Amino acid sequence: FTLIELMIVVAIIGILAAIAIPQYQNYVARSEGASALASVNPLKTTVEEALSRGWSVKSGTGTEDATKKEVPLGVAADANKLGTIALKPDPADGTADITLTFTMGGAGPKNKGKIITLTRTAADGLWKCTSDQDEQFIPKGCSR
Secondary structure, three states: OOHHHHHHHHHHHHHHHHHHHHHHHHHHHHHHHHHHHHHHOOHHHHHHHHHOOOOEEEOEOOOOEOOOOEEEOOEOOOOOOOOEEEEEOOOEOOOOOEEEEEEOOOOOOOOOOOEEEEEEEOOOOEEEEEEOOOHHHOOOOOEO
8 A cells, every 4th residue: 555556546536537427417418308308299299189170289287178179288397307398379279380398497507497499380380399408418300
């Protein structure tokens, strides 16, 4: 046991860590982005099916309403602790553009507060994904 042998040990560990820690963080950041997108992507089908039958869509976990012709999304706003899910306009009947968003309020330093948006243009019924995260953490298929 000597001070030189100690300094080298500490030097080795400090280097392997200085390299790995930033990589781990980056990996977590990419994973958060994918999880946010995966929580709203399935909801596009719920929107399309309601519209294709002349009905509207509403947020929340209520029941189908035959009087007002509204279908619920079936998921609580905070079901995924990474953030919050939102629909706009609410309710939506397809005569105007629609957005499904996931706001990452519970994410780590890199993504905290960033937003992933799925936009449906009423004219042609096409969906497009955009994000305001740092480019390196944006999911494949989405853009700024």
